[PDB]
Every structure is written in structure tokens, then in C-alpha cells.
Amino acid sequence: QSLLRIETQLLLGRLLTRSGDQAWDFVVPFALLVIFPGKLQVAAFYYLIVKIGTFLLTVVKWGVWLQFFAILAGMVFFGMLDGLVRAGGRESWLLSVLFIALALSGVMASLGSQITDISVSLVAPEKLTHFNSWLRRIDLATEVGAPILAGALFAFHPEQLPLAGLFLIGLWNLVSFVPEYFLLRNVISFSDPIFWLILSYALLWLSVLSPHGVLLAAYLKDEMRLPETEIGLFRGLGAVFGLISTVSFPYLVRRLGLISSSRWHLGFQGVTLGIAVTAFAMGSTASVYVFLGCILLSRVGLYGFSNGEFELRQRLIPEGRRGELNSLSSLTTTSATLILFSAGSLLPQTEDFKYLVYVSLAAVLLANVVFIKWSSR
Ligand SMILES: O=C(O)CN(CCN(CC(=O)O)CC(=O)O)CC(=O)O
Ligand SMILES: [Ca+2]
Ligand code: NI
């Protein structure tokens, strides 16, 4: 139960790589709203380009080079985007060229994250169960750590420099490239009743009510005026509540069926998201705190259901019809976020983000109805 010399450099590489990746991706929606205040639409259009382009394009050594050039291009193009919009001449041909170039750096930034995760065959197949159990502590450390830290870097900026934190996050990402490289260099359908079980899981990917959702982050900062410090605290806590689901779900799976554990978890998610939406339409004084607090509670239900849906798939489809339904599972999940970010791209202003919250609760409640009806076989 001891990390090896090479196995430690693998762990130390995943930590440095993901910390820089996540911290930069957290502050990018904040930067896109600093530049374009009152237009969540533009931040949604940015990610729509990244989502599509990433899917299209998708070699292990190129990972750190791609992130380096991506963050480098992002800082140069974010600075140009900032200075040009601040001049006063809007909707130039030049304004579009910089944005699309900035969005092409987002595709490049995402490919580096995926490829560098591939590099994290080298661990002894006996010591792999201790290894794989450790990476979860590293991954958990970046989820809680980088949004919290990066939110403090973006929010505690000097007076006349709102994007002062963005470049500090990118300069971090560039300077860390020298550690990361040497570490990684050294050690490197039509008629199937189970289609409805997939579709119930898929609908939940249309909900914007996520602590790790970029659309919530833009709305929380722009319209609801939450500090990036408290938005990061929102994100880091959202990962901690999903951890609670790792105890709650095996415990209900013992005293109740695996179906009842998934049903009561997905039912819990819908209930707590319903409470959140009501307060979201209430006096915004202390109801924002309830709004975000109920989203945290709902993570236990969502992650509980995802473990059930995964386990139900593992026990229900035979190996012959397995990879095909995975193409279906991956399809519906892709289409949901595609629809999510396409619908958000059409928002006439940030304020009508409320109309995406409502469909989200509709989807979570609907996904509940579909699973309850399915689980009656
Ligand atoms: O929240 C987002 O930005 C988009 N999420 C939403 C899908 N979520 C479901 C949720 O958080 O409600 C997937 C998941 O992590 O379970 C996609 C992703 O995490 O890859
Ligand atoms: Ca990096
Ligand atoms: Ni999500």
C-alpha cells in the first residue's frame, strides 16, 4: 500500500495538470461576462463551439504542449478581446475573428486536458487497486481546491483590472508546464425496454442546476452578483455532497432494492431541486442561499441515481448488446448538452436564464417519472 517512484510521478502529474486545467476553465465564463456584461448568451456560444469542435476532433505527448499553446493563445486573445470591446466600436469583423480564435483555443485547451488524462500499463496489476483508489483523492482535491482558489484569484483583483486574476491563472498554467512536462516525460434502440432507463439518465444532462455548470457560474456572477470566491465555494461543496452519495447509496442498496435506492435518490434530487426553484422565484435576500443550498443537497440524489443507472445497465444488458447501447448512452448525453448549450446560446439576455432553470426542473421531474414507470417491469 505504498506509492512507487514512478507511480508517484504519475499522481503528481495528474495533480498539477488538472489543477491548472480546472482553475482556468472555472474563470473563463467569468471573464467572458466581464467582457460582455449582460450577455450570458455569448459565454454559452463560446462553449457551444468548444463542445462541438472537441467532439469533432476526438499522441499522448502532445497534451502539455496543447494546453500550453492554448492557455498562451487564450491570454493574448482575451487581452485583445478586452481592449477592443472597451474601445466602443462594436460588432467589427475584427471582434468576430478574435472571439472565434479564442473559441478555437478552447477546443485546443480541452483536447490537451483529455490527452493528458490518458497518460494518467505502468502500475503493477496488483498495485493498481491501491493506485486507482488514490487518484480519486487527487481528483477530489482539485475539484474542491481549484474552484475555491481560482475564485479567490479572480475576485480579489486590483481596482481597474477585473481580468487581473485570469492572467494569474494562465501564468500559473504556463509556469506549471515546466514541472508537468518533466514529470510526464520521465514516466510515459427501436424496441428495447432498457432504452428508457438510458433516457431517464440522459434527461438529467439538460439541467443547468449544477455546481460544476458553467451556465450557472455566469448567471451567479452577472445577474445575482455572487463573488467568484463564493461561486467557487459553491462548486467545491457540490463535489463534497456527491461524496455523501457514496455512503447513502450502498446503504439503501442493502436495506432496499437497487431499484429503490436509485428511485429514492433520483426522487430526492427532484424534491430538493423543486424546493430550490421556488426560492429562486422568492425574495432574493436569503433565498439565493437556499437556492444554492438545495442544489448541493440534490447532488446526493443525482450521483446516487447515476451509480444505480450504471449498475442497472451492468446487470441488465448482455455483453453482446453492450457496446451498442453505450453508443446510445453517449449519444443521448451528448445531444442533451448540445441542446443545453444551443438553447442557452439563443438567450436574448442574461436575465432570462430563469427560463432555463424551469426546463431543468421539468427535466429532473420528468426523468423521475420515466424511471418510476420503467422500474415497473
Ligand atoms: O453542468 C454542466 O456544465 C454540464 N454537465 C452536466 C451533466 N452532468 C449532470 C449534472 O451535473 O446535472 C453530468 C454529471 O456530472 O453527472 C455535463 C458534465 O458534467 O460533463
Ligand atoms: Ca496547464
Ligand atoms: Ni454536470
Residue numbers in the entry: 4 to 61, 76 to 137, 144 to 211, 238 to 426
What does the paper say about this structure?
Ferroportin (Fpn) activity plays a central role in human iron homeostasis on both systemic and cellular levels. In vertebrates, Fpn is subject to post-translational regulation by the hormone hepcidin, a key event in iron pathophysiology. Hepcidin binds to active Fpn and signals the endocytosis and proteolysis of the Fpn–hepcidin complex when systemic iron levels are high.
To delineate the functional rationale for the Ca2+ dependence of Fpn, we obtained a new crystal form of BbFpn in the presence of CaCl2 and determined the structure at a resolution of 3.2 Å. The asymmetric unit consists of a single monomer comprised of 12 TM helices organized into two domains, as is typical of MFS transporters. The structure revealed an ion-binding site localized in the center of the N-terminal domain. We tentatively ascribed this site to Ca2+ based on the constituents of the crystallization condition, and hereafter refer to the structure as Ca2+-bound. All of the side-chain oxygen atoms, except for that of E203, are arranged on roughly the same plane along the membrane normal, whereas E203 forms an apparent bidentate coordination with Ca2+ from the intracellular side. Most prominently, the coordination of Ca2+ by N196 and E203 produces a distinct kink in the TM6 helix between these two residues, resulting in a marked displacement of E203—the carboxylate group is shifted by ∼5 Å. However, this pocket was empty in the structures previously obtained for BbFpn. Unexpectedly, in the pocket of the new structure, we observed clear non-protein electron density, which we have unambiguously assigned to a Ni-EDTA complex carried through from the protein purification procedure. In the structure, the EDTA moiety is seated in a largely hydrophobic area formed by residues from TM7, TM10, TM11, and is hydrogen-bonded to the hydroxyl group of S256 and S259, carbonyl group of H261, and backbone amino groups of G262 and V263.
